[PDB]
Amino acid sequence: GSYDNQTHYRFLGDGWVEITALATRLVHLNMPKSENYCRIRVHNTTDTSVKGNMAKDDAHEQIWTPWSLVDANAWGVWLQPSDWQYICNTMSQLNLVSLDQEIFNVVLKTVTEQDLGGQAIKIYNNDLTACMMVAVDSNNILPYTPAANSMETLGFYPWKPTIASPYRYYFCVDRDLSVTYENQEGTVEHNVMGTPKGMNSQFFTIENTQQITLLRTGAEFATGTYYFDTNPVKLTHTWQTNRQLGQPPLLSTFPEADTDAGTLTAQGSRHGTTQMGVNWVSEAIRTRPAQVGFCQPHNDFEASRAGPFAAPKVPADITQGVDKEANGSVRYSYGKQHGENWASHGPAPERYTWDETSFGSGRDTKDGFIQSAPLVVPPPLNGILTNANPIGTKNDIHFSNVFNSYGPLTAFSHPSPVYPQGQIWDKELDLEHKPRLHITAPFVCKNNAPGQMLVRLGPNLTDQYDPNGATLSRIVTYGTFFWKGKLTMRAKLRANTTWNPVYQVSAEDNGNSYMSVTKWLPTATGNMQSVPLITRPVARNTY
């Protein structure tokens, strides 16, 4: 029964900090809309029957459970904006050690109607006998639904009450949606969503799969110390592109003044190795150890059995010919509970394009080209496939949209954790050949995910209860409880090597910069906001 909410750094020897984060929020649990598990076939035939709207398709089928989950899978739950700044400036890498959770001070209440002055007011009595059910999926039978996807985790301000994210999982049906364009003459050949297949139909109930701990008013619950098995993410970014790996060419002449340029040895009489057949070596055509960053086939919509979906890109830099979509810049969309300014009296969420700090893996899709199989030094008109030639028959789809250049020697940095609206852990997929990375979470658990902590208000019935005919009348209940977490981490402090001062995440004055300190400060009525900080300030050397 303690409201611990602060982070303790415990400096061991050899520069190994043990960051022990702590979080505590008041979760406001409400009664379900129904106590029944039900599959709801979502289909937007008013939005995909228009020609060209295949990216506007969100038609699916989901089992909707009466349970709701307490998901704390975001960094803003555990760390302050000043704690992320102290970690990112000073530590060199971050790892996850353990995760301990707890539920205490369970309080359940009912509502009642009383007439006062001609109107009806609410009366909030206590239930000293009604319970709430806690199920922890420690073996992971149920589907893993992280609430950081729909932005439904716990609130990032410790002094605010939190709602609980309702639990639902995907039921697997068929969907076949035709491919048109923006003003196509004709029709949509297929817009049909199928039936439950007998092969792969999984109806998971929480009751038949979990061991449920009933919590009456005044009871506490605890899951003891899940231990992580993840790989350490790095809090320093890389800058070396493919043209900055190895030894530079030695200069024949040196600059006399500070503004002059140094000339190299001529290309016909220069040493080194190439892979082209020309009898000259330059900085562009050389033999590098590997290829830093690769060319994604950006904005492709693969079509599996469940309808079209955009293929996920690995996030890289948006290099100066600025292309956010061609490199996979994640566009977040969060609410008032997760970082929006509370003075935003609008229905639209606050949205932010996350810019990736790894400057070596970006692909400028306007200065990339492909020449012919022998190398001529000026290529002719038919000997170069530039990024302005139409692929197929149509313009606006050049070769960079279909060129996939992932190879056996492609190296790329792990994508950085965005601080407030991020996601900490994700479980690895149950397929036999698992991907190398997840683009949603920097820590992919190798063995087993921590438990989905599901909570549910137990049903309080009225006296007229007939279990046969068509009705379920129950007393209106709501419950509030405290959740306490404890995320132990393990960081390594930064060594100082370079001469010049490195980049640090400081907070500027009240202006119009992005680290304006008026953001992380409550207003005259208390409207806090959390905007994303930078994760990897200090550069590191790749090679």
Sign of CA dihedral 244, 247, 248, 249: negative
Binding span for its own copies by CB under 8 A among 95-103, 178-186, 220-228: 178-186
Distance between CA atoms of 526 and 488, rounded to whole angstroms? 31
Q: CA nearest 358: which of 539, 88, 502, 515?
A: 539
Name the residue nearer to its own copies (CB basis): 209 or 225.
209
Query: CB neighbours of 178 closer than 8 A, spacing ≥ 6?
Result: 188, 189, 190, 191
Told to check if 155 binds its own copies by CB under 8 A, we report yes
CB of 9 to its own copies, least distance (A): 7
Place of tokens 């301990």: 100
- Give the number of C-alpha atoms closer than 13 A to the C-alpha of residue 172, restricted to the C-beta side: 11
Interface with its own copies in residues 62-81 (CB under 8 A): 62-64, 66, 80-81
Of the candidate residues 49, 149, 225, 447, the single one contacting its own copies (CB under 8 A): 149
| H helix or E strand, kind and range, residue 163 | strand 162-163
Of the candidate residues 322, 324, 355, 486, the single one contacting its own copies (CB under 8 A): 324
Interface with its own copies in residues 411-430 (CB under 8 A): 411-414, 426-427, 429-430
CB of 250 to its own copies, least distance (A): 6
Binding span for its own copies by CB under 8 A among 95-103, 220-228, 399-407: 399-407
CB of 229 to its own copies, least distance (A): 17
Classify 519 as helix, strand or coil: coil
Interface with its own copies in residues 465-524 (CB under 8 A): 465-470, 475-476, 478, 480, 482, 493-510, 515-524
Would you say 139 is a known binding-site residue? yes
Place of tokens 């070396």: 240
Of the candidate residues 287, 446, 447, 514, the single one contacting its own copies (CB under 8 A): 287
Classify 181 as helix, strand or coil: coil
Q: Using H for helix, E for strand and C for coil, what is the string for 94-133?
A: EEECEEEEEEEEEEEEEEEEEEECCEEEEEEEECCCCEEE
Distance between CA atoms of 213 and 220, rounded to whole angstroms? 10
What is the gyration radius of the CA atoms in the chain, in angstroms?
A: 28
β-pairing verdict for 131-137 and 119-126: unpaired
Q: Which residues pair with 410 in a beta bridge?
A: 291
Of the candidate residues 95, 98, 138, 282, the single one contacting its own copies (CB under 8 A): 282
Told to check if 32 binds its own copies by CB under 8 A, we report no
Size of the site for its own copies (CB under 8 A): 360
Of the candidate residues 97, 102, 172, 448, the single one contacting its own copies (CB under 8 A): 172
Name the residue nearer to its own copies (CB basis): 31 or 99.
31
Of the candidate residues 209, 222, 446, 514, the single one contacting its own copies (CB under 8 A): 209
CA dihedral 198, 199, 204, 208 (to 10 degrees): 90
Name the residue nearer to its own copies (CB basis): 99 or 449.
449
508's tokens: 């500027």
- CA angle 83-88-93, nearest 5°? 115
Interface with its own copies in residues 356-385 (CB under 8 A): 357, 359-385
Interface with its own copies in residues 179-198 (CB under 8 A): 179, 181-183, 190, 194-198
Of the candidate residues 221, 399, 425, 443, the single one contacting its own copies (CB under 8 A): 399
Of the candidate residues 213, 220, 226, 486, the single one contacting its own copies (CB under 8 A): 213
Interface with its own copies in residues 227-256 (CB under 8 A): 233-234, 237-251, 254-256
DSSP label at residue 83: H
Distance between CA atoms of 297 and 399, rounded to whole angstroms? 9
Interface with its own copies in residues 37-56 (CB under 8 A): 37-44, 50-56
Name the residue nearer to its own copies (CB basis): 227 or 465.
465
Of the candidate residues 72, 317, 455, 491, the single one contacting its own copies (CB under 8 A): 317
286's tokens: 């050389």
538's tokens: 């200090």
Sign of CA dihedral 312, 318, 324, 325: negative
CB of 490 to its own copies, least distance (A): 14
| Binding pattern for the stretch 431-470 against its own copies, x by CB under 8 A and - elsewhere | xxxxxxxxxxx----------------xxxxxx-xxxxxx
Told to check if 146 binds its own copies by CB under 8 A, we report yes
Distance between CA atoms of 281 and 158, rounded to whole angstroms? 60
Residue 361, Cα to own-chain centre: how many angstroms?
19
Binding span for its own copies by CB under 8 A among 11-19, 95-103, 222-230: 11-19
Interface with its own copies in residues 257-276 (CB under 8 A): 257-264, 267-276
Told to check if 143 binds its own copies by CB under 8 A, we report yes
Q: Which residues pair with 324 in a beta bridge?
A: none
Annotated binding site: 139
Annotated binding site for Mg(2+): 139
